[PDB]
Structure formats: C-alpha cells, structure tokens
Amino acid sequence: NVFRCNVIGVKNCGKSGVLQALLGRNLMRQKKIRSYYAINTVYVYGQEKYLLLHDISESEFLTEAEIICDVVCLVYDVSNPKSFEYCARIFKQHFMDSRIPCLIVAAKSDLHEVKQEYSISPTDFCRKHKMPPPQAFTCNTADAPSKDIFVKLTTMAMYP
Ligand SMILES: Nc1nc2c(ncn2[C@@H]2O[C@H](COP(=O)(O)OP(=O)(O)O)[C@@H](O)[C@H]2O)c(=O)[nH]1
Ligand SMILES: [Cl-]
C-alpha cells in the first residue's frame, strides 16, 4: 500500500534533504543536482510499503488539500532557533485536532544544536501531546542517509 506524508518546516530547514534521503542520496550528491514529492519502497515488519513524501512550503496557513495525509513530518532545524516555533504553530493550527499522527524530526543533527526560541522545548512538546520523542536526522553522511525515520513514519501512517 501507498502512504502519504506531509513534510512541514521553515525555509531552508532541510525539507528537500529529507525527500532526497528517501531516494538514498546524501547531502553531497544533492548539491550536485539542479520535485516537491518523493516516493520509495519502505519495509515494515518484512512487508513492502510505499512512502510518498510531500514537500510543504513555508506559509501562513495550510489549505484542506495540504492537510490531508496519513502522517505528518514536522521538521525543524537544530541550528535555526526559530525553526521549531513554526512546527508548533502549524501543528496547533491544522493537526492538533485532526487525529493525524505527527512526528517531530530534528534535522541537520550534524550541526551544532542551539536553544530554540519557543516557550516549550521540542522534547517537552512531544511529551505534552502524546507524540514520539524528537527524531534526530541528518542527510550529510558518507553513505546513504539512515532510513530510520522513514520506517517510523510509514509505521505511524498505517494507523487506521
Ligand atoms: N549540515 C547539513 N546541512 C543540510 C542538511 N540538510 C540540508 N542542509 C543544507 O540546508 C540548506 C537548505 O536545505 P533545504 O534542503 O533546501 O531545505 P528546504 O528549503 O526547507 O527544502 C542547503 O543548502 C543544504 O546544504 C543536513 O542534514 N546537514
Ligand atoms: Cl519552504
């Protein structure tokens, strides 16, 4: 089965990097490339699934067409202290009452982590809203980026 995931975060938070990481391309190969969607096979419990990622550009609000999905990937940049505030805002605005599972991903984990300019820490925010702990991620690797978050996203997408 095919599952859809909306990747949401500020400009230059690493959304495009997440999509290309699904395609198995590290940051090194990405920067030598001149879509807002990405799909690949993801295996959960030995079974073949398809995960379709949607790059959602930073905006004031999301339309009903942008909201519908099987799982939401809230991406913030650990080197950008204003990145998580957007994720929290979008969540409360569209997904807090949607019964759609959300996963907060701390992208660019290879960089130095700074204090986010939000009243609630990303860790506390996840605990407050029954969400999994913030998932560390980076596509700036020697080999292909880890597909751990994609297995987890697909797993959550299989919720009824
Ligand atoms: N160090 C590091 N830099 C990254 C990573 N992912 C993206 N970047 C850099 O962040 C910049 C913008 O990221 P981008 O993928 O365009 O995010 P987007 O605009 O939200 O889709 C690019 O110049 C990338 O080189 C990462 O995992 N590690
Ligand atoms: Cl954007």
Numbering used by the authors: 417 to 450, 455 to 580
What does the paper behind this entry write?
Human Miro1 and Miro2 (hMiro1, hMiro2, also called RhoT1 and RhoT2) are MOM protein homologs that play a critical role in mitochondrial trafficking38394041424344. Here, we demonstrate that the cGTPase domain is necessary and sufficient for efficient ubiquitination of either hMiro1 or hMiro2 by p-S65 Parkin.
To better understand the difference in ubiquitination efficiency between hMiro1 and hMiro2, we first determined the crystal structures of the isolated cGTPase domains of both proteins to high resolution (hMiro1-C: 2.25 Å; hMiro2-C: 1.69 Å). The dimer interface is a highly conserved hydrophobic surface along one face of the cGTPase domain, which, in the intact hMiro1-BC structure, forms the interface with the second hidden EF hand (hEF2). The cGTPase does not mediate dimerization in the context of the full-length molecule, as the hEF2/cGTPase interface is mutually exclusive with cGTPase dimerization, and hMiro1-BC is purely monomeric even at high concentrations. Interestingly, although the same conserved residues mediate dimerization in hMiro1-C and hMiro2-C, their dimer relationships differ significantly. Subsequently, we successfully disrupted dimerization of hMiro1-C in solution by introducing three mutations at the hydrophobic interface (V418R, Y470S, L472A), thereby generating a stable hMiro1 cGTPase monomer (hMiro1-CM).
